[PDB]
């Protein structure tokens, strides 16, 4: 039918195994012209076969804005150009990376439970609107630890470290002036399958 | 385009708010048929509208293996069937449960510290490779307790109960012949936020 705007969604990181679309020339159109963000990847054959020639990369270009025009036997545009939008669908091909391998923090004796005093942070180049770039932070270990009582907690979404109820009650620089936490981060929103992880080390001084 | 295998990942425990996918019939296809693990949940409209009509439950079915076929006006399959995979993403919707509500054990006086003599165990129906099913064991209280000294300890990952150094030094059937421990188990790795818990009771006789 008439040439019109179209959107195609194509996963990145996959070498092409299927065409995108076969356009059919409406006489007096005989050939097609593809322009825009083709990047030596998107091709239209003379008689309308639109395809891609190699794996896409959302982290290089997340949308290819293309245009297609239909031309007559004299090379005159008779339909379009119209916008053809390629949405590059994300895969989990980037690992989360803590921005420091060691954090130095401090907390006041009697800091209110749940009040952040330190943020750890990781970046993930995947799409944060998808599981692939959605990070989940956790405390792997606290040292020292007495009778399995955690004195620290982390906001699993934000990386905010705060005292627990019991940490607020028990932390005392006279008894134990420093704690080490090992923190993990994983992508896939903390789900198991196809996830990547990183760790960092946090030393926390307890002050008056 | 042509029917091909597709995977969708959907969280359990949420009322559906969006369709899954609209299949568009390419002539001579006119309608679609859905088969497989539909479970009075997954439906396709003739026209192509694939949706789910009630919350999923990973603990009932963790992957729905569906198939979609395109039928012509005479009900001949002209495309597919192709596998449509629904991966059900886990939420923390199950409380961990101890396998016994009461444990009875014993420990010999002058037993070595840190050597397990009793395992408590809980199970959690959520995914154990996620925080939702990741368990953390603690002693809530030991009675009797002498001068604020713990005589017992528990491994927070394994549920292994052993004597402390002080317990090994002080246990004596003539002075205190029995102890009770209340043990907790928590999921989310033991953090307070978004976690569920159970408790059990452990009676321990001190022997000669
Ligand atoms: Ca990529
Ligand atoms: Ca990632
Ligand atoms: Ca990616
Ligand atoms: Ca469930
Ligand atoms: Ca659980
Ligand atoms: Ca669950
Ligand atoms: Na205490």
Author numbering:
A (entry chain A), B (entry chain B): 29 to 236
Quoted passage from the original study:
Liver intestine (LI)-cadherin is a member of the cadherin superfamily, which encompasses a group of Ca2+-dependent cell-adhesion proteins. Human liver intestine–cadherin (LI-cadherin) is a nonclassical cadherin composed of an ectodomain consisting of seven extracellular cadherin (EC) repeats, a single transmembrane domain, and a short cytoplasmic domain. Because human LI-cadherin is expressed on gastric cancer cells but not on normal stomach tissues, LI-cadherin has been proposed as a target for imaging metastatic gastric cancer. Previous studies have reported that LI-cadherin works as a calcium ion–dependent cell adhesion molecule as other cadherins do.
Contrary to the canonical Ca2+-bound linker, such as the linker between EC1 and EC2, the linker between EC2 and EC3 in LI-cadherin does not contain Ca2+. Generally, three calcium ions bound to the linker between each EC repeat confer rigidity to the structure. Another unique characteristic in the region surrounding the calcium-free linker was the existence of an α-helix at the bottom of EC2. To the best of our knowledge, this element at the bottom of the EC2 is not found in classical cadherins.
